[PDB]
């Protein structure tokens, strides 16, 4: 089978700048190449067909070029809404529709401190014998961030699960959730619960706490 | 760059595909299939003054199926002719294609849907005199059980028509129609009656006669079938509405089969060209082009009682079970006889078991629409047709021979 | 308007088959062919096969032994059926339109995708819990202990869409958990009602959980 290689897994860029996404076919595919844009949680969308033809409705800042083996998708002036995974594909010969591995874009923007919110276990969950404490670290930049949980001032890592969103298409920030799962019995044996966010936007961590009371 | 293909399946592409093709090319690509095999041709890529011709047989001899230029792949073709050819032409101007083919085996009633509903009749095979100005009633929507409107012309008159090119000579035995309910207004439309026009070439037309007026629909939803009084042999079909409720709207199916679906009924090579010009001869001519005598392919016909003859050398002994006779492009033969030989020297007439004499066959009633005439099978390498009675204009004829390998 | 609407199961037991229907509108199957593609973390995007106008098919050589694509023109429906699924067939399956009736062309419109998990683990509905504080206010919902993926979360039936963050699920013990946050002006809550709407189609679960102040 023909292999379509996108060597750029991730590319950093800036609103207004030019982005050049490359794709290399392992054999000659003529101009039988398409490019697709896929935003998080969405289906792919056709941008370019026959290597260089812009699909109807696709904005002018998207241009495709190349023939034979070397193909390029150019975004002439990056917009925050262009955050996506971009895929090439060939349909020159059988088996057709081999896809590249995708190139994800990242946008550099101004620093933003996280908005941190902590939530105790709901009464509903407590009734069922469980206790999850949730912390949201929302709308921050840059990406790197650290979360620590403390129970009456002592750290707890076991039972902590984290999840992160992809970069937001409107404001180019990241968000993170952190969830500390305990038994009700353990939860009830302690008073103070703290979510601690360390981020380059401040020398001291952001601390949100509650007392089980 | 010319190549013949005989394997069960293979690929056919422009020289140097997928690299840009060289200039000033004339390539010939011929698929040859054994008897009772169908050739299925599918295009994968197509990008091209410059053209690709598809021929029902030998190029410039067999009928032209279609001529293609742009960036649209030709629709799938299924031929039972035994041969299907491509010619690819390019010039110096800025500069292809990739295809694949398969060879597959093929109470039998001649009542098979020909492919309006299934799509085996492609959009490019369907056309019309006009279409409704909002664009929601295109000819391509005239498919039986289609869920999006149907075909409607720009004007409601008995001059409008829906046309279907079957691409190959086909047996037509029935027509089904529906009207349609508008998805925009929910108004119902249907054809109440129509005439049928047919043609082997798309230029020469015959209105089907009992003019046979077919009674069609009485609502917008139900299929009405009209079975023909006898099978027609044709390539092009026109449905011509005569009366309608509220307006003309049509969804359609055509029914029939291929000539080759009958036992020992292969076209032996006059139409296609596998019977070459040197194998074709006659008692007298207008001095001649041997190709002028070919069924359907010819743009004229053989022009010279029971003295003139047209003769076909099949090349090797075969079982002969009939002929296809056609008029000339206006004259035609109304009555004829047939003789045959195994060595080209001595002859025997096709007998009529009833009258125990040389059989007097019915010819045509039109100059274009052909007629099949079968007879008890006999061994023969050579066949002669002797015109006996003809139209007032005189003797004019095109011919094919029907049969199979001897057994 | 051109749409491809997929219908099919979220959970398939090992060695059983997967059927998906692609119902198309705004175009005819006799005018445009239809492809099937899947997407997984481990293998990326993979073409499975197509059907052309007229019903002729083409399959990927990796799937030809166990894949059928067929259609009903009168219903504008394409039927996908693949046999003997195993763990590595876990993926999001898509139908996508061929840009023409025949030929290899680009995929110009796509269905919404059908998430398919191949497992002997059992369908489990989510428990949904409100997250209330112990000027903007952040609220949330914890959607815990469901299987398989996916769930959807909306706030006030989609009226609150700005300021929402729904997080990817995390998998522990053949059970998925995710949270969703919403941020609103403190002049809107708790004076006005805020509700998360959770759906887990695979268990036929629809839950609305109002967020009210504690204590």
* C207 touching A (Cβ < 8 Å): no
CATH number of B112-257: 2.60.120.260
Beta-bridge mates of residue B361: B336
CA B334 – CA B134 distance, rounded (Å): 49
The pairs formed by A143-148 with CB atoms below 8 angstroms and a separation of 24 or more are: A143/A106, A143/A167, A143/A174, A144/A199, A144/A200, A145/A114, A145/A174, A145/A176, A145/A197, A145/A198, A145/A199, A146/A197, A146/A198, A146/A199, A147/A176, A147/A178, A147/A195, A147/A196, A147/A197, A147/A198, A148/A195, A148/A196, A148/A198, A148/A205
Chain centre to alpha carbon of residue B211 = 22
Report the half-sphere exposure of B345 (CA within 13 A, side-chain side).
1
Token pair belonging to B263: 């036992």
**Rounded to whole angstroms, how far apart are CA atoms B194 and C101?**
30
Best CA proximity match to C179, nearest among C155, C158, C203, C213: C155
Residues 6+ apart with CB under 8 A from A201: A111, A112, A113, A114, A140
Is-contact B63 B297, C-beta < 8 A?
Answer: yes
Bond prior to B18 in cis (omega within 30° of 0) = yes
Q: Name the residue among C185, C203, C184 with its Cα closest to residue C140.
A: C184
Q: Distance between CA atoms of B134 and B149, rounded to whole angstroms?
A: 12
Q: Check residue C202 and report its DSSP letter.
A: G
Rounded to whole angstroms, the Cα distance separating C215 from C117 reads 41
Partner-chain residue, chosen from B18, B20, B71, that has the shortest CB–CB distance to A92:
B18
B19 interfacial to chain C (CB closer than 8 Å):
no
Q: How many CA atoms lie within 13 A of C193 on its CB side?
A: 8
| Tokens 């799937």, residue located | C63
Nearest to B142 by CA among B255, B253, B256: B253
Distance CA C155, CA B66 (A): 58
Q: What is the largest CA-CA distance in chain C?
A: 66
- A49 and A85 fall within a common domain: yes
Cβ neighbours for B228, distance < 8 A, ≥ 6 positions apart = B172, B173, B174, B175, B208
Please list, in sequence order, all residues whose beta carbon lies within 8 angstroms of the beta carbon of residue B355, skipping any fewer than 6 positions away.
none
Are A100 and A132 found together in one domain?
no
Q: Quick check: B45 and A28 in contact, CB under 8 A?
A: no
Q: How far apart are CA C43 and CA C79, in angstroms?
A: 24
CA end-to-end distance (rounded Å), chain C = 51
- Rounded Cα–Cα distance for residues B284 and C58 (Å): 54
B98 touches chain A (CB under 8 A): yes
Tell if the CB–CB gap between A95 and C60 is shorter than 8 Å: yes
For residue A194 the two structure tokens come to 């703290």
Three-state DSSP state, B238: strand
Q: Check A30 against B19: CB less than 8 A apart.
A: yes
Q: Which CATH class is domain B266-405?
A: mainly beta
Cβ pair A134, A195 in contact under 8 A: no
Method: X-ray
Return the bridge partners of B253, or none. Answer: B176
Domain boundary among A108, A132, A158: A108
Q: What chains are in contact with C, requiring at least 3 Cβ pairs below 8 Å?
A: A, B
The answer to whether residues A31 and A89 belong to one domain is yes
Q: Are B327 and B397 in contact (CB under 8 A)?
A: yes
Alpha-carbon distance of A122 to B96, in angstroms, equals 67
Provide the shortest C-alpha distance from residue C108 to chain A (in Å).
5
CA B228 – CA B223 distance, rounded (Å): 16
The neighbour count for residue C208, using CB atoms within 10 Å, is 12
List the domain range (segments joined by +) for residue A151.
Answer: 115-211
Q: How far apart are CA A171 and CA A140, in angstroms?
A: 10
Distance CA A37, CA A45 (A): 5
In this structure, are A78 and A140 located in the same domain?
no
DSSP secondary structure letter of residue B17: T
Pair A98, A32 in one domain: yes
Whose tokens are 């066959």? That residue is: B361
Rg (CA), chain B: 23
Same domain membership, residue A97 and residue A9: yes
Residue A124 phi, psi (nearest 5): -55, -50
- Contact flag C104-B118 (C-beta cutoff 8 Å): no
Which one of A87, A120, A138 has the shortest CB-CB distance to C165?
A138
Cα separation of A97 and A33, whole Å? 9
Element (H, E) at A126: helix A123-127
Inter-chain CB proximity B45 and A92 less than 8 Å: yes
Q: Tell me which H or E stretch contains A125.
A: helix A123-127
- In the A/C pair of chains, how many CB contacts fall below 8 A? 128
Partners of C175 in the β-ladder: C172
Q: What's the CA gap between A105 and A100, in Å, rounded?
A: 15
Cα–Cα distance between C61 and C63 in angstroms, integer? 6
* Nearest residue in chain C measured CA to CA from B74: C102
Q: Do residues A123 and A78 share a domain? A: no
How many Å apart are CA B72 and CA B324, to the nearest integer?
A: 35
> Using the 8-state DSSP alphabet, how is residue B82 labeled?
S
Find tokens 């070459």 and name the residue. Answer: B276
**Containing H/E element for A185?**
helix A184-188
- Cα–Cα separations (whole angstroms), residue B321 to A36, B33, B356, B403, C135: 59, 21, 18, 5, 95
| Domain boundary pick from A93, A108, A123 | A108
> Which residues 115-174 of B have a C-beta within 8 angstroms of A?
none
Total CB pairs under 8 A between chain A and B: 24
Please name every residue paired with C70 in a beta bridge, in sequence order, or none if there are none.
C79
Cα distances from B272 to residues B55, B74, B198, B262, in angstroms, run: 9, 21, 21, 19
d(CA B212, CA B197): 10
Q: Which domains does chain C possess?
A: 3-118 (2.60.40.10), 127-210 (2.60.40.10)
Same domain, A27 and A100: yes
Hey, which residues 190-209 in chain A have their CB within 8 Å of chain C? Answer: none
Tokens matching residue A104:
């994800």
Q: What is the phi/psi pair of residue B162, to 5°?
A: -105, 130
3-state helix, strand, coil in chain B (%, to 5): 5, 50, 45
- Binding-site positions of B for Ca(2+) read 50, 91
CB contact under 8 A, B117 and C56: no
Q: Are the Cβ atoms of A32 and B45 closer than 8 angstroms?
A: yes
CATH number, domain of A206, equals 2.60.40.10
CATH architecture entry for B3-105? Sandwich (2.60)
Q: With contacts defined as CB-CB under 8 Å, which chain C residues touch B74?
A: 102
Distance (Å, whole) CA C146 – CA C171 = 9
**Residue B374, C-beta contacts closer than 8 angstroms, at least 6 positions apart:** B265, B321, B322, B402
Backbone angles phi, psi at A126, to 5 degrees: -60, -35
Which residues, 6 or more positions from C25, have their beta carbon under 8 angstroms from its beta carbon? Answer: C1, C2, C3, C5, C76
CA B4, B8, B12, B15 dihedral sign is: negative
Token pair for B139: 């000819």
Look up residue B196 and give its two tokens.
């049928």
Residues A119 and A204 in one domain: yes
Residue A49 touches partner C, C-beta closer than 8 Å: yes
Query: Which DSSP string do the residues of A2-36 spell out, in sequence order?
Result: --EE---SEEEEETT--EEEEEEESS--TT-EEEE
- C75: how many CB neighbours lie within 10 A of its CB? 14
With tokens 């489990």, the residue in question is C124
Residue C144: strand, helix, or coil: strand
**Those residues with Cβ within 8 angstroms of residue A16's Cβ, 6 or more apart along the chain or in another chain:** A77, A78
In terms of DSSP bridges, do strands B224-245 and B251-257 run parallel, antiparallel, or are they unpaired? unpaired
Instruction: Report the b/e string of A128-163 with b at 16+ CB within 10 A.
Output: eebbbbbbbbbbbbbeebebbbbbeeeebeebbeeb
| Residue B291: strand, helix, or coil | helix
Residues B195-214 as b/e (b if ≥16 CB within 10 A, e otherwise) read: bbbbbbbeebebebeeeeeb
Q: Distance (Å, rounded) from C-alpha B12 to C-alpha C112? A: 36
**Sequence ranges of the domains in chain B:** 3-105, 112-257, 266-405
> Which tokens in the block code for residue B238?
């026109």
Contact: B143, C73; criterion CB under 8 Å = yes
Residue A32 to residue B245: CA distance in whole angstroms: 48
Q: Do domains B112-257 and B266-405 have the same CATH topology?
A: yes
Smallest Cβ–Cβ distance between A93 and the set B19, B20, B98 belongs to B98
Are A87 and A9 found together in one domain? yes
Rounded to the nearest angstrom, the minimum Cα separation between B26 and chain C is 23
Q: Residue A115 corresponds to which tokens in the numbers above?
A: 């908005």
User: Quick one: B130 exposed, middle or buried, by C-beta within 10 A (0-12, 13-18, 19+)?
Assistant: middle
A8, A99: one domain: yes
B53 Cβ contact partners less than 8 Å away, ≥ 6 residues apart:
B59, B64, B66, B67, B68, B86, B87, B89
Residues A63, A65, A71, A76, Cα dihedral to 10°:
-30
Closest residue on chain C to A212 (Cα): C134
| Inter-chain residue contact C144 with A165, CB threshold 8 Å | no
Q: Does C78 touch chain B (CB under 8 A)?
A: no
CA torsion sign for B88, B91, B92, B94 is: negative
C107:A36 CB<8 A: yes
Residue A135 and residue A73 share a domain: no
């Amino acid at each position: 089978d023909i292999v379509m290689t996108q060597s750029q897994k991730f590319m950093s860029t800036t609103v207004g700048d030019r982005v050049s996404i490359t794709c290399k076919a392992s054999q000659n595919v003529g101009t039988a190449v398409a490019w697709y844009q896929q935003k998080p949680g969405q289906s792919p969308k056709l941008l370019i067909y026959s290597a260089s033809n812009r699909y109807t409705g696709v904005p002018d800042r998207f241009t495709g070029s190349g023939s034979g083996t070397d193909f390029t998708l150019t975004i002439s002036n990056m917009q925050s809404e262009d955050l996506a995974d971009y895929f090439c594909q060939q349909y020159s010969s059988y088996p057709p529709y081999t896809f590249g591995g995708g190139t994800k874009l990242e946008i550099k923007r101004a620093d933003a401190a996280p908005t941190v919110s902590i939530f105790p276990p709901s009464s509903e969950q407590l009734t069922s014998g469980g206790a999850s404490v949730v912390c949201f670290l929302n709308n921050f930049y840059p990406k790197d961030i650290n979360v620590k949980w403390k129970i009456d001032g002592s750290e707890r890592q076991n039972g902590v699960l984290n999840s992160w969103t992809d970069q937001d298409s409107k404001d180019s920030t990241y968000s993170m959730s952190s969830t500390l799962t305990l038994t009700k019995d353990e939860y009830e044996r302690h008073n103070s619960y703290t979510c601690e966010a360390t981020h380059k936007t401040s020398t001291s961590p952001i601390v949100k706490s509650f007392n089980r009371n | 760059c010319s190549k013949n293909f005989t394997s069960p399946n293979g690929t056919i592409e422009s020289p140097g595909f997928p690299e840009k093709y060289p200039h000033n090319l004339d390539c010939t690509f011929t698929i040859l299939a054994k008897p009772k095999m169908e050739i299925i041709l599918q295009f994968l890529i197509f990008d091209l003054y410059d053209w690709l011709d598809i021929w029902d047989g030998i190029p410039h001899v067999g009928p032209l199926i279609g001529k293609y230029c742009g960036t649209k792949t030709p629709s799938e073709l299924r031929s039972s002719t035994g041969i299907l050819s491509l010619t690819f032409h390019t010039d110096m101007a800025v500069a292809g294609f990739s295809a694949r083919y398969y060879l597959v085996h093929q109470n039998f009633q001649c009542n098979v849907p020909l492919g309006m509903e299934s799509g085996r009749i492609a959009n490019e095979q369907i056309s019309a005199s006009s279409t409704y100005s909002d664009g929601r009633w295109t000819p391509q929507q005239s498919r039986l059980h289609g869920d999006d409107n149907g075909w409607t012309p720009n004007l409601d008159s008995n001059k409008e028509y829906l046309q279907v090119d079957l691409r190959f000579l086909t047996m037509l035995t029935a027509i089904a129609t529906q009207g349609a309910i508008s998805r925009e207004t929910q108004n119902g439309y249907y054809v109440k009656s129509y005439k049928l026009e047919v043609s082997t070439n798309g230029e020469d037309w015959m209105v089907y006669r009992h003019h046979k007026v077919f009674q069609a629909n009485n609502d917008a939803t139900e299929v009405v079938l009209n079975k023909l009084h006898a099978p027609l042999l044709t390539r092009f079909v026109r449905i011509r509405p005569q009366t309608w409720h509220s307006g003309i709207a049509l969804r359609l199916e055509l029914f029939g089969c291929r000539v080759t679906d009958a036992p020992c009924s292969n076209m032996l090579g006059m139409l296609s060209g596998l019977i070459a010009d040197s194998q074709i001869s006659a008692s007298s001519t207008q001095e001649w082009s041997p190709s002028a005598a070919r069924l359907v392919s010819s743009r004229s016909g053989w022009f010279p009682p029971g003295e003139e003859w047209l003769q076909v050398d099949l090349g090797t002994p075969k079982t002969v079970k009939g002929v296809i006779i056609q008029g000339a492009r206006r004259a035609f033969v109304r009555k004829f006889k047939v003789s045959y030989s195994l060595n080209g020297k001595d002859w025997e007439y096709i007998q009529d078991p009833r009258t125990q004499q040389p059989k007097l066959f019915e010819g045509n009633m039109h100059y274009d629409t052909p007629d099949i005439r079968r007879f008890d099978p006999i061994p023969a390498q050579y066949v002669r047709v002797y015109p006996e009675r003809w139209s007032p204009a005189g003797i004019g004829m095109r011919l094919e021979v029907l049969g199979c390998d001897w057994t | 308007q051109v749409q491809l609407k997929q219908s099919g199961p979220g959970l398939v037991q090992p060695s059983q088959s997967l059927s998906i229907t692609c119902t198309v509108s705004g175009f005819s199957l006799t005018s445009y062919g239809v492809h099937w593609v899947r997407q997984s973390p481990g293998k990326g995007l993979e073409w499975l096969g197509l059907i052309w106008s007229g019903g002729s098919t083409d399959y990927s050589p990796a799937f030809i032994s166990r894949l059928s694509i067929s259609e009903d023109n009168s219903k504008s429906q394409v039927f996908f059926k693949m046999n003997s699924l195993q763990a590595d067939d876990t993926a999001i399956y898509f139908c996508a339109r061929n840009s023409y009736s025949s030929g290899y062309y680009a995929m110009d419109y796509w269905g919404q995708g059908t998430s398919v998990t191949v497992s002997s683990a059992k369908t489990t509905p989510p428990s949904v819990y409100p997250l209330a504080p112990g000027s903007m206010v952040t609220l949330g919902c914890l959607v815990k202990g469901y299987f398989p993926e996916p769930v959807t979360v909306t706030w006030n039936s989609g009226s609150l869409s700005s300021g929402v963050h729904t997080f990817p699920a995390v998998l522990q013990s053949d059970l998925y958990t995710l949270s969703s946050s919403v941020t609103v002006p403190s002049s809107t809550w708790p004076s006005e009602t805020v509700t998360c709407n959770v759906a887990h189609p695979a268990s036929s679960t629809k839950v609305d959980k109002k967020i009210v102040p504690r204590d």
